[PDB]
From a paper:
To gain further insights into the molecular basis for the biochemical properties of TtAA10A, and to probe this, potentially unusual, dual Cu structure, we determined the crystal structure for the recombinantly expressed protein to 1.4 Å resolution. The overall structure revealed a core immunoglobulin-like fold decorated by loops and a helical bundle as typically observed for enzymes from this family. As for all LPMOs studied so far (as defined by their activity), the active site of TtAA10A is formed by the “histidine brace” motif which is located at the centre of an almost flat surface. A single copper ion was modelled at this position coordinated in a typical T-shaped geometry by the amino terminus and side chain of His 1 and the side chain imidazole of His 107. In the axial positions around the active site copper ion, TtAA10A has Phe 195 and Gly 105. It, therefore, appears that the copper in this enzyme has also undergone photo-reduction to the Cu(I) oxidation state. Our structure reveals the position of the second copper-binding site that was observed in the EPR spectra. This site is 14.4 Å (Cu…Cu) from the histidine brace copper ion in a large negatively charged patch on the protein surface. Tyrosine 3 is adjacent (5.3 Å) to the second Cu site, thus providing an efficient charge transfer pathway between the two copper sites.
Author numbering: 1 to 78, 79E, 80 to 152, 153C, 154 to 208
Amino acid sequence: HGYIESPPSRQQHCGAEQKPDNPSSAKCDEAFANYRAAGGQNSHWYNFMSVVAHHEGRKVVKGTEHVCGFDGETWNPAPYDTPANWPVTSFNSGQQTFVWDISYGPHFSDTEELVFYITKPGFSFDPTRELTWADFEDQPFCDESIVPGDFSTNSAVEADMANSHINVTCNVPSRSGRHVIFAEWGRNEHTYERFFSCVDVDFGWSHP
Ligand SMILES: [Cu+2]
Ligand SMILES: [Cu+]
Ligand code: NA
């Protein structure tokens, strides 16, 4: 059970930090409101660690209706599929570390891969519609696997047992303006259990 903590995923902002029954910030208000308007329940955001399936993820499974929720098991659509102006954090291309928090279900021992996709370079973020696969690159920009549970087998993937985190280092493609990263944490074939996390990032406008 997990989600991306850094950079903060939709589940980190709206889930780990802000809860709809007692928010301390306005940043998730639209996501919370639009989900209630669509018949979603406030209590669903308490399952921010549970965007889950039991299969090989987007490298294999091409037919999902939804991106961030991946037509998963806890709810479909997920809270995280809701069209909204989601909270966005400033981000840079090149070598970046992504931090999965797996504290609520620290399945280190049969972790197999961490996969990351980004929106196409010409993507135009639309807060009124759901993400579609046409918004995303066909292939992942970062796909790091280990012999299951053996983190010494990939120098890009680190287990932090003290924080119950997995740290993955990725080469983030050059981007400008507002983008989305779609990420997966997959366990091996014993379960094929896989967790999904979207990150809203703003690359700004900078060129040498
Ligand atoms: Cu943490
Ligand atoms: Cu779990
Ligand atoms: Na490693």
